[PDB]
Every structure is written in C-alpha cells, then in structure tokens.
Amino acid sequence: VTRYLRLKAPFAAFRPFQSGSFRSTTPVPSFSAVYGLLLNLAGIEQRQEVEGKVTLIKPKAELPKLAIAIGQVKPSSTSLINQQLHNYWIAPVRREVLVNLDLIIGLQSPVEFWQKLDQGLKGETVINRYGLPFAGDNNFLFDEIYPIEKPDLASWYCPLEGACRLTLWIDRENNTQTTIKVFSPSDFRLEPPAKAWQQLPG
C-alpha cells in the first residue's frame, strides 16, 4: 500500500515442484518466490527450508505483514534449452527459459522495511541471505529499483472461482497444499482491486 517497487531482469525462470523430466515455467513468479526475494533483499536467515543436510528450522512466531499484487501485462515468449544434468551419473534433460518479465510488484509492511530499503543504495557490513526463495538454485537472479509509484499502469489478476498453480507458504517436507492461486487474468486498470491483496502466513 505505502510502496510499490518494480524491477526487471534480462531473463527469469520459475520451476514448479515435482517437475520430472520436463521442467516448465510459469509466466509470473509465485507469491512465495517474490516474498522470499524481497525478504532476501531485507536480509534474513533461511527458516522455512528445513534442509535434510543442515538443521535450519522455521520458528512459528514470524509475521511478515505483507500483502502483494502482481501479474504480467507484456507478452514474454518461452524458449526450450536442451542441456545435460549430472543429477538423475549424467542424463540429458531439457527445460524452459523466460525471455523477460514485467514490473508491477507492490508491497505493504510496517515501517521497519523502509529503513533497510533506503539503506539498500549504500551498504555497510552486509550479510548474505540463505533462502533463495522459489528456487534454491542460484545464478538466475537480477534486481532493479524504481520508486516511481503510480505511473506505468498494468493489469492485476484477482484469484476467483492464466497461472493455474502458484505455490503458497513454501512447504518442503510435504506439499504445502495451498493449491492454485487462481488469479487468472486481471482486467486492465490503473489501480489494482482490493481483492488482489492477500495475507501470506509465510
């Protein structure tokens, strides 16, 4: 509500769980993906991902007071890249790549977020972030900053009874079971509807 920050990247990729031998991508990042990314920008320890190699547990009393509205207005083609992966010795498997993405991300939060974002331009004693939201894998992240507020209007999609599946709460041991966001397609508007915003437990 108090700040909508938009950012672009030369490419992107968001691969849903249990893909199998055909890794696919969605036209938009998931809610949890952008949540983890911005949280990463702020800087936090890897809590939700209870890895089987190291004990990084998520304490329950965390309340990110964030409601977000996203969506894609511009068209972005998806291309197929054929490559070889060592993980099952080595077997070849091909995946997808997204050419581009749009810049409409909006955020609400209590005042403490703005201090870190303001300090973002200048950094002192910075600490790395463990989570890598949406995708554990690295080498695929780029970021931008635009405080331009209202201008550059674009569509907002409100989930109703299109991206069929959006993951919610980033569960690792078992499927989160949040189910599809069902945002579908949002009619063009300068200001997103109130139904676009929603609360995420984590």
């Binding site: 030369p10 890895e51 190699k53 291309s79 490559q83 070889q84 050419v99 910075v126 080498n139």
Partner: protein, 295 residues
Amino acid sequence: NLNLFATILTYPAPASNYRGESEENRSVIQKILKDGQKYAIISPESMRNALREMLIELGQPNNRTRLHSEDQLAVEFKEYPNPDKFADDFLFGYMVAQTNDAKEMKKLNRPAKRDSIFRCNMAVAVNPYKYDTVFYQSPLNAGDSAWKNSTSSALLHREVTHTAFQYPFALAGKDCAAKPEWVKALLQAIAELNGVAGGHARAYYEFAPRSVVARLTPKLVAGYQTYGFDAEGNWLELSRLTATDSLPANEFWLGGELVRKMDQEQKAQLEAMGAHLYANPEKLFADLADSFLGV
C-alpha cells in the same frame, strides 16, 4: 567496494557449439528470442567448465576432474570435498548428499555448499541469425571391413553464422583471508579464456579480448547498464547520456579496447573524470583487481 559487475564481448568469427538434434540429421544452433528474429546462445555451464579447465591449467588443487572413458559421461568423485579446498571448492561448487554420508561427514565443515561468489548469464549473438548453411559430410566406407562403421555414406547440412557475442558476469567481495590468491588467478583466467564449445577441429574461434568495462560499486547488485552492446560495437552512447552529467558519479566507469578510437578530445575531459586510462584489456585486470581487493 564490495561488488564488481562487468560485460565482455569479442571479435567476429563463424559459429559453433551446437546442442540440438534433428530427425533428418541437420545440426541445429539454439534459438531463444521470438520477436521476428533469431539468436544463438551458450549455456553458462560450458564456460564454467572451461574456467574449471583453465584453473586446472594453472597450478591449482581440485577435487573434480573430467576423465575420458566409456561412452557413459562420468566425473571422478575423488575424495570428500572440503570448504578449505585451495582452488575450486572454496571458489564455488555445490554438493548435495542423499544419505549425507556418515553423521554429516563426522560433524565437520558444512553439509550443503553454496556456490555464490561467481555469477554468469546468457551469451547473446547481438546479430540476427540467417538461414545460410553448408552441406559438408561425405563419410567413408571400409574396403577391408576392419572395424567397419555404418554401411552407407550420406550427405548432410551444417550452418554457421559470422557473429560475435557478449556476456555479463559479477562477483562480490566477502572474503579476504585466503580469497585474494585464488581471485587473482580467477581474474587472470577470465581475462583470457578459450573453448566453451565441442567442435574445435572445425570452426575455431577464441573470445577473450575486446572492449571491456567493469564497475566496482557498493550498490548491492543494482546496475544502470542495460546489458547490451552495439551491433557495430560503438555502444558508447550510454556513456554520453551519463558521463556528461557527472546520476552516476565520476568514478563509475572503466575502459577497454574501444578507447583506441581515433577521437581524443572527450578522452581528455573524461580522463580528469574517469580512470579509463587503459588501452590493453589484460593490463586492466592487473590493477583494478587490487582496487576491488582490500589491499
């Protein structure tokens, strides 16, 4: 002072490094962009492998090596990797263990390793693909049937493109205890790399030296650059809308091969403003690496 971004391009030359396969057996080059024009790309894993190879070339320890063996593609496990590995594992390399060996490698080191440190991106031909191709192969048949190959001999096509492509990269300054010795070697290697392809018996080209520009800023990974160079190579326009207004500051640019353009007047005014006093790209990495480093 803790982050360094850069982009590198090269000289024009024909193309190579195919990945796809055809039913009718024409080798095909990768295509990504759907806007009425085609482009050729290279996955970062190939150049990562080449960088590993040239780290092996210089005297550097390693726990990973490629062995030429039976048809199945395999890599030598060697011994248990440690974070205090002198050259490669500390530099990058992620290990994931299904069983996590014995009691988390005996409660030592850290179980999962974060690559971090080094970053890469696509390589874009910045020149549209053309339907030109050449049919080249006319295989042989044994006259004595001693280890005879396929019976018939066919004629198939292959395509090349007279193109030069660029790619960005970045790295952050976090460690200074043992990092500088290996970072010097990494910068020496990235300043001059070769390969990043399979077919080098044919279509030989090397893409180390050209007009390079790097930026060392505490921006926390924000870049004014669009990550795109001119097709002709005179990408300097983005500097003109910026350098005259020093809103990047005076010490927010560097120089490479392009500096030897015949024009000189604005070089003098930019010399008092930017430290792009280098004409040899190899020399640039020798000095600005020290500035990026703590000492």
